Amino acid sequence: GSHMLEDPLRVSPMIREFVQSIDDREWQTQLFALLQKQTYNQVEVDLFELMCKVLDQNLFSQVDWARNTVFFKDLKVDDQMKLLQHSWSDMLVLDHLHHRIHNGLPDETQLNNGQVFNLMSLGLLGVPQLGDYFNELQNKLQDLKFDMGDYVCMKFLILLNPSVRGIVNRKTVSEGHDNVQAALLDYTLTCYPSVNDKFRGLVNILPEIHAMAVRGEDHLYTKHCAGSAPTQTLLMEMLHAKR
């Protein structure tokens, strides 16, 4: 139910459609697949680099998702690019927030290398120190009964942010953001009546999540400056954009 919609009988079509666009399975599959491929038959690997590899892949998938999004369709690339550039970091955390809670993703895994990958890092973007903060959010979210439905709406909310510098077709973005908020509100009201101010509780998180993303992007960029990771990646390009 957490990873599922609450009262499917009472859910809007829009939301159902949003949940359509998520294949959790593919995400986890893709994740371990890369991890296996990157590590089997290798004596040692740079764990930091690997995390980046995962993130790079995630980004591609992120882009793919947005692309097929109903709202993006009505958008020009320049505009889409700007939106994606703004919150890629933001989505990763939430996505991680989603898996950690909904799908029982663990903090670490044994690599078949005898090496251990900190999965948890993926959601901290390499800043270990944010774990308490990440956790605080995970707890807040759980108490709010964060569900699969909530998670998708929040993604759009994050993505479809009008107050983003340089976006030409502002109206469309505002409208979509505005719809989703409403849809989210409705869902909370109809399907989680018992949870008071759930809408606000969830909406309030986004700002918090963003703060985490910022630290994370900066660390990731700082690391790239040091020569720690490949420069040709989408991840770097994304990291680069705001500079």
């Binding site: 591609f60 882009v63 793919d64 947005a66 692309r67 993006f72 690339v77 889409q80 690019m81 994606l84 550039q85 989408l234 390009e237 994304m238």
Partner: peptide
């Protein structure tokens, strides 16, 4: 440009 390529297609 890579970003653009992906969404440009």
């Amino acid at each position: 440009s890579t970003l653009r390529a992906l969404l440009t297609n």
